[PDB]
Nucleic acid binder design. Structure first.
Lengths: 104, 98, 53, 124, 71, 127
RNA sequence: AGUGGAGCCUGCGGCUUAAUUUGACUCAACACGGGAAACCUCACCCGGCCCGGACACGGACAGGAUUGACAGAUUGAUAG
């Protein structure tokens, strides 16, 4: 039977995330699994605020760094192992990809 | 610190066999990583290693308030005699060669 | 002949410090960083934090 | 194996036992070790200051396996166990006695261990 | 500088005179050890240990802090 | 020099419990009644690891006759809340640089030692 | 729109304090040191423990170098 599988992809790097996502989608359908297509989730902006000045005299100067984590999921439905197998191969560095047994 | 030369030999043997030994630095700590001499702040493990170090035999790298002991060639020879175990027993380095 | 040399701390800023030095005031505990701000400035490149705004 | 000499046969066992941690040196440790079955040798001095020391040792030996072999000079007995390097003009812990000592656990096979054990059995 | 200095003598190390240590029991001929002082029955006791006489407290220093006659 | 009807004339309740009843209850039964600051200290503390200090109080109260006050018993703590057991003692209450000596009378019960010792001048500028 | 005027808050000066740790002095010092500090912290001040005197060399010295501790003395601490 078909099994509902959720592929979560998490990263911070648009271009890398995007062309990993590409490869998963394209290779999925190529030897037949569900296509779906990406559910983009809101990018989360982690904001850290610090004093720019060690030892505070002068003027109030503040520095704010952000780090933008990006999340997307894709729900494929098709059979068990050959899903998570054909997907998770052909990638090694720098974009997290999680294949989850979640969803019935 | 203080403590017998039964604790000291235990530490030295573990350094010899692994080829690494580690401690961490805090005075509010209770307990160094890699077994230690067990719920105590910075001391016994560090001091046994420090004594060993003074006479050569181990190279210490410090960074991010942690002590990485890296076993030296001369140290492999010294501990081999001190432990008095057969004259090759393989100290966990030389292993695979590139 | 130690009898006491620690005392329980889990209270205020005095119970934690930077993970490369000992420091107080402005200790980032958010995201499990556990570094003082002054140190964090020099390592802000290495965590992945970046300024654009 | 081997058959060695009788006096050097003791010394090697004393040295091994020290590193193992199992050489009872001086009266308090020697007596405690003797009165327990961990002991399997007792080498006494008989050149002790105030031989009440030796009398107490011999008395202790009677219970919990009797082991007796006598050797001469306190200082030599001390040195044999190891408390000096036998090097340099000084040593910081240099040559001093320990008098009567008791060996708990030989801790090695063959050699001097085998010699002393064999000698002890056919002696007693 | 704060406050803090102290005299010492060995205010900082222990020696307890020079110690008597183990010189007690009574021996008659070869070989027996006949009780002197008091003896302490515990499992953390040795086998030639004593209770220091110090009368109306009688405490085995081989025991950790415990095991005391007050007789 | 100890207990009620003696160094008191303000009397009545401290806080809900009359000094008569107070002095002949134990601290157990005291914290049950009308006591909120004291109650938090005793509950969370749980007999409060000031053990030896408290024993020195009882010791010098005992060895001195009940007709007179103790030989004075110092403490470094000043966060100690006066409990009826203590009362009639004479307590050296540390200020981090001075021990002010304060007899604990029946009017002081439920108050803190620290409030009867000073770290602070009446404040002057040449006044 | 106020601010300066008022109350309080917070930093700063001066005094006072055994201690009021301390950097800074038009701007380019001054609710500024992400500094909203109970003690703890803590630098300051009032006291006390410990050696983390490693290592090498010398001496002492296993007849006991050193470790622990009852009760009593003590002391903030039945902290041997």
């Amino acid at each position: 039977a078909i099994h509902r599988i959720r592929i979560t992809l998490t990263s911070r790097n648009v271009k890398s995330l995007e062309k990993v996502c590409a490869d998963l989608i394209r290779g999925a359908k190529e030897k037949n699994l569900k296509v779906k297509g990406p559910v983009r989730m809101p990018t989360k902006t982690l904001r850290i605020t610090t004093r720019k000045t060690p030892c505070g005299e002068g003027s109030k100067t503040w520095d704010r760094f952000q780090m933008r984590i990006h999340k997307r999921l894709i729900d494929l439905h098709s059979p068990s192992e050959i899903v998570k197998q054909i997907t998770s191969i052909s990638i090694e560095p720098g974009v997290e990809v999680e294949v989850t047994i979640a969803d019935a | 610190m203080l403590m017998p030369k039964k604790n000291r030999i235990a530490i030295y043997e573990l350094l010899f066999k692994e080829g690494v030994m580690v401690a961490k630095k805090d005075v509010h700590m209770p307990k160094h990583p890699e077994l230690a001499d067990k719920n105590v702040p910075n001391l016994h493990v560090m001091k046994a290693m420090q004594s060993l170090k003074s006479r050569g035999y181990v190279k210490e790298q410090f960074a991010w308030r942690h002590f990485y002991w890296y076993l030296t060639n001369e140290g492999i020879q010294y501990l081999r005699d001190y432990l008095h175990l057969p004259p090759e027993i393989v100290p966990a380095t030389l292993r695979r060669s590139r | 002949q130690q009898l006491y040399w620690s005392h329980p701390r889990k209270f205020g800023q005095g119970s934690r410090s930077c993970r490369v030095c000992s420091n107080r005031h402005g200790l980032i505990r958010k995201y499990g960083l556990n570094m003082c701000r002054q140190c964090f400035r020099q390592y802000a490149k290495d965590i992945g934090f970046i300024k654009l705004d | 194996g081997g058959v060695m000499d009788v006096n050097t046969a003791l010394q090697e066992v004393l040295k091994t036992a020290l590193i193992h941690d199992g050489l009872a040196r001086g009266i308090r440790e020697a007596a405690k070790a003797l009165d327990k079955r961990q002991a399997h040798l007792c080498v006494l001095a008989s050149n002790c200051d105030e031989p009440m020391y030796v009398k107490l040792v011999e008395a202790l030996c009677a219970e919990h396996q009797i082991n007796l072999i006598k050797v001469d000079d306190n200082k030599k007995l001390g040195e044999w166990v190891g408390l000096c390097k036998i090097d340099r003009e000084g040593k910081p812990r240099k040559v001093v006695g320990c008098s009567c000592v008791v060996v708990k656990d030989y801790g090695k096979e063959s050699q001097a261990k085998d010699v002393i054990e064999e000698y002890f059995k056919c002696k007693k | 500088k704060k406050s803090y200095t102290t005299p010492k003598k060995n205010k900082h190390k222990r020696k307890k005179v020079k110690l008597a240590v183990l010189k007690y029991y009574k021996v008659d001929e070869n070989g027996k050890i006949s009780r002197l002082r008091r003896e302490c029955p515990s499992d953390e006791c040795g086998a030639g240990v004593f209770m220091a006489s110090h009368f109306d407290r009688h405490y085995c220093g081989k025991c950790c802090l415990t095991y005391c006659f007050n007789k | 020099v100890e207990q009620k009807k003696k160094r008191t004339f303000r009397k009545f309740t401290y806080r809900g419990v009359d000094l008569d009843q107070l002095l002949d209850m134990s601290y157990e039964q005291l914290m049950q009644l009308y006591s909120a600051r004291q109650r938090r200290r005793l509950s969370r503390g749980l007999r409060r690891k000031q053990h030896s200090l408290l024993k020195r109080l009882r010791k010098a109260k005992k060895e001195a006759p009940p007709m007179e006050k103790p030989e004075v018993v110092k403490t470094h703590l000043r966060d100690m809340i006066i409990l009826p057991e203590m009362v009639g003692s004479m307590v050296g209450v540390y200020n981090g640089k001075t021990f002010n000596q304060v007899e604990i009378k029946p009017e002081m019960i439920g108050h803190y030692l620290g409030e009867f010792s000073i770290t602070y001048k009446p404040v002057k500028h040449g006044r």
